[PDB]
C-alpha cells in the first residue's frame, strides 16, 4: 500500500511537472462564436415510452432509436419516414448502435445481452443474428468496430470485446471499480475510453487488452464520454453538473464546463465536426452548447418536455439529433 | 414525390398503424415491481402468482399482470431504478421472522431498503403492496432486540401490528398508500390481495385525475 501511495504521488508530481499553463491562457486571444441559433428542423414521433439511446448511421441520414415500448425504429431523417420497426425480445433496453457498414444494429439493457440484428436479409425482414451473453451486469453501451467485432460496457464493472461469428468474448477489460456507463471509440478504433461509477475514465488498448491511462477528477458518476475528432482528447459528463476535457498525450485534465445555474446531471455529450463545440444533454430537459476552447456557453436547445437522454452529431456534421424521455427525437440545425 | 417515394411513405404509415395497435394492446396490462431484501419471500410470492431481469405473467379475472424481479441485478440501483418509473405499483417483501436474525440486523436492513425505495424521487406517486412474510415462523419465534424502545407486550398480534406501524411510518407523502398484508407462505389466494390493492390504486389515480383526490 505504501508503494501504491508513492506511485500515486509520483504520477501526481509528473502531471504537475508537465502543466505550466492551461487552455485559458492559450485560447484567450481567440475570438468567440457568438450565439448559436439552432431550430428543430424535424421531429420524429413514433415511440410510446422513454427513449434511452439513439445512434446515427454513417450516411448521415439513417438513425436508430431505442425505447422502453420494446421497439427499435430505423428512421429516415430527411423524409421523417420510418424504414424499420424492430420488436425487441426484452423491452428494458438501455443502448443501441448502428454498424458503420449499415448492415447491422445492436441493442441491449437489463437482459445482460447484446442482441445483433441483420438488416439485409434475403427474406425481407429483420431478424436476430446473434445474442452475446457473457456479462453479469446490464448492458450500458455497445459500439461496432466492424461487422464482426463489437465492444460492450456493462454494469458488472467490466468491458468486453466480442467475436460476433462465434458469439464469444475475445478480450475482457477489467480494472474499473464501479458500473461502467459509457464508451467511445477512437476514430482509428485502436483505443477506446470508458467512464464508470467511480468518477474515473480509463484509456484501453483494444488489441492488447490492458489499461493505458486513468483519468480522475470528477466528483460523481461519469455518465457520458465522447472522443475529440483529432483523437488526442476526450470529454466527459457526470452527475456533478460538469463536463471536463481530458488529454491523452498530456495525461491531464484541461478544462471544466460548468455554470452556477446548472445543478442537474449530464446524460450525454458530443462534439461537432471540428471541435469548437461541446453539446451536452442534461436532466433539466435542455441541451447546452459550449465553446470547447473558451468554456463559454454558446447556446441552448430548448426542445423536449422531459430529460434529454441521448444526443448525436452526424458523420458529416450537418445536424444534431437529440432524444429524450418525452418520447420524441428532434433534429436540430 | 415520385413512385418509389409514395410506396416508402405507404410502408411508413403501415409501420405507424402497427405501432399504435401494439401500444393499445400494451396499455391493458398491469406492471408490477418486486423489491424485497435478499431472502425475504420474493420467491414465495412469485410462486403464488403461478441473471438479468425475470418477468412472470399471470392472468386473474380477465386481466394480465406483469411482475418484474430485479434481484439478479447485483449492480447499483441508482442507475436503473428509473426504468420502472411508470409502473403501477411496487410489491415489497419482508420476513417477519428476521427480527432476531443478524446478517447489524436483517429487519433494520429491510427498513433501510423500504425507506430508500419509498422516499425515491422516481416513486413519489407510486404506491406499495407490502407483504409481511413468514407469518407462522414469526408466530412461533415470538421483539426488543430489534426495537428496544417498544417496551410493550410479547404477543403475536401486538408485535405484528407494531412492526407494521413501524414499517408504514416511513411514507411521508400524501399521494401514495401502503397496502399491507401478512402471508404464511401457504395462503390460498394472495392474487386477490394484489387485485384488490390494484383496484384501489386505479380508483385513486382516476379520482386524482379529476381534481378529486
Amino acid at each position: 500500500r505504501q508503494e501504491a501511495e508513492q506511485l500515486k504521488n509520483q504520477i501526481r508530481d509528473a502531471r504537475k511537472a508537465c502543466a505550466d499553463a492551461t487552455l485559458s491562457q492559450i485560447t484567450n486571444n481567440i475570438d468567440p462564436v457568438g450565439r448559436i441559433q439552432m431550430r428543430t428542423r424535424r421531429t420524429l414521433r413514433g415511440h410510446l415510452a422513454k427513449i434511452y439511446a439513439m445512434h446515427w448511421g454513417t450516411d448521415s441520414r439513417l438513425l436508430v432509436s431505442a425505447s422502453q415500448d420494446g421497439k427499435l425504429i430505423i428512421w429516415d431523417s430527411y423524409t421523417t419516414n420510418k424504414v424499420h420497426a424492430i420488436p425487441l425480445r426484452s423491452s428494458w433496453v438501455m443502448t443501441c448502435a448502428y454498424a458503420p457498414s449499415g448492415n447491422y444494429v445492436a441493442c441491449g439493457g437489463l437482459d445482460n445481452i447484446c442482441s445483433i440484428y441483420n438488416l439485409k436479409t434475403r427474406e425481407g425482414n429483420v431478424r436476430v443474428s446473434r445474442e452475446l451473453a457473457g456479462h453479469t451486469g446490464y448492458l450500458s453501451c455497445c459500439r461496432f468496430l466492424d461487422d464482426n467485432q463489437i465492444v460492450t460496457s456493462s454494469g458488472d464493472t467490466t468491458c468486453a470485446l466480442w467475436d460476433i461469428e462465434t458469439g464469444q468474448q475475445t478480450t475482457t477489460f477489467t480494472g474499473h471499480t464501479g458500473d461502467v456507463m459509457s464508451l467511445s471509440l477512437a476514430p482509428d478504433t485502436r483505443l477506446f475510453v470508458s467512464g464508470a461509477c467511480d468518477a474515473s475514465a480509463k484509456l484501453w488498448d483494444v488489441r492488447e487488452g490492458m489499461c493505458r491511462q486513468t483519468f480522475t477528477g470528477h466528483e460523481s458518476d461519469i455518465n457520458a464520454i465522447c472522443f475529440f475528432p483529432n483523437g488526442n482528447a476526450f470529454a466527459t459528463g457526470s452527475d456533478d453538473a460538469t463536463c471536463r476535457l481530458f488529454d491523452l498525450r498530456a495525461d491531464q485534465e484541461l478544462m471544466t464546463y460548468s455554470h452556477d445555474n446548472i445543478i442537474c446531471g449530464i446524460t450525454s455529450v458530443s462534439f461537432s465536426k471540428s471541435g469548437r463545440l461541446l453539446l451536452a444533454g442534461y436532466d433539466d430537459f435542455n441541451c447546452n452548447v459550449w465553446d470547447a476552447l473558451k468554456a463559454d456557453r454558446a447556446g441552448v436547445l430548448a426542445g423536449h418536455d422531459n430529460r434529454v437522454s441521448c444526443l448525436g452529431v452526424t458523420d458529416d456534421g450537418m445536424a444534431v439529433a437529440t432524444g429524450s424521455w418525452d418520447s420524441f427525437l428532434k433534429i436540430w440545425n | 414525390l415520385s413512385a418509389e417515394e409514395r410506396a416508402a411513405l405507404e410502408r411508413s404509415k403501415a409501420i405507424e398503424k402497427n405501432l399504435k395497435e401494439d401500444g393499445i394492446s400494451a396499455a391493458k396490462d398491469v406492471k408490477l415491481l418486486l423489491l424485497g431484501a435478499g431472502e425475504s419471500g420474493k420467491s414465495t410470492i412469485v410462486k403464488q402468482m403461478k441473471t438479468g431481469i425475470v418477468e412472470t405473467h399471470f392472468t386473474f379475472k380477465n386481466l394480465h399482470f406483469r411482475l418484474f424481479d430485479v434481484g439478479g441485478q447485483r449492480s447499483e440501483r441508482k442507475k436503473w431504478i428509473h426504468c420502472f418509473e411508470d409502473v403501477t405499483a411496487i410489491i415489497f417483501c419482508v420476513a417477519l421472522s428476521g427480527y432476531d436474525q443478524v446478517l447489524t440486523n436483517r429487519m433494520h436492513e429491510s427498513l433501510m431498503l423500504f425507506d430508500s425505495i419509498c422516499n425515491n424521487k422516481f416513486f413519489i406517486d407510486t404506491s406499495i403492496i407490502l407483504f409481511l412474510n413468514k407469518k407462522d415462523l414469526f408466530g412461533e419465534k415470538i421483539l426488543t432486540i430489534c426495537f428496544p424502545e417498544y417496551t410493550g407486550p410479547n404477543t403475536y398480534e401486538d408485535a405484528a401490528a407494531y412492526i407494521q406501524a413501524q414499517f408504514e411510518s416511513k411514507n411521508r407523502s400524501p399521494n401514495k398508500e401502503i397496502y399491507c398484508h401478512m402471508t404464511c407462505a401457504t395462503d390460498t389466494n394472495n392474487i386477490q390481495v394484489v387485485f384488490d390493492a390494484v383496484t384501489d390504486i386505479i380508483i385513486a389515480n382516476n379520482l386524482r385525475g379529476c381534481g378529486l383526490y
Partner: single-chain antibody
Amino acid sequence: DVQLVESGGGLVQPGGSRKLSCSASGFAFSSFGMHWVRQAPEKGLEWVAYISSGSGTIYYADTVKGRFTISRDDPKNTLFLQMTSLRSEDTAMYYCVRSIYYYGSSPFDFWGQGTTLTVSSDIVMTQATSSVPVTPGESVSISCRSSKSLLHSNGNTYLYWFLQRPGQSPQLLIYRMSNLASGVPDRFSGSGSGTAFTLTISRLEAEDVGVYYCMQHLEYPLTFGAGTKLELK
C-alpha cells in the same frame, strides 16, 4: 432460398377467361409489393399490374385496364391475376415479381419462372441497336435513351437494368442507374446523366450472354426498353 412459382397458364379460346396464380415461399410475402410482367412470344418485356404490400394501391396498364384484376392473399402467400376477354394480344409468358420499397432497397430483385398463356403520356424507352456482337474478354457499352428525364428532384435517377439469360427469367443487375444488385459481379457498372444511360461490362465472360433490358421506374406505367441482345461471335 426465395421462390415464386406461377401456375395456371393453358390454351383458352378468344374472348374467354383464365386466372393465374403465383405461389410464394421462403420470404415475408406481406412486406413486398407484387408485379405482373408479361413477355410476348416474339420479343420484349412489358408491365401488367401492381398491387402494393398491404393491398392498398393497385395500378394497371392501358391494355389491361378493365379486363384484368390483380389480388393477393397473404395467409396463403399467393398472388392472383383474374383475366377476362382474352384477346390475341394476351399470349405471353407471365412473371410474378417481388418488390419492396424503403430508403435504399432493391425493387424488382426476384422474378418467378413463368406460365405460357396461349389463345386462338408514357415515358418511351429506346435502345439502339437491338443486337451487338461481343467477344469473350472485350468490354461493351449498352445504352438506353429515354424521352422524359428520369432524374428526380430528390437526387435519384430511376433506371433499372435487367439481364435475361436465354431460357430463364430476367434478373436485376443495376438499380437506380448506378447501384449493383446483390449477387452480381463488379464487372457490371451503371452510368449516365438524366436522359442518356450506359451499362458497361468489363472482361466479359460467356455466361453474361443474353438480352439486356432497361426499365424506367419514375412514373406509372412502368416502361421497358426494346431490348439489346449480346451473342457469341
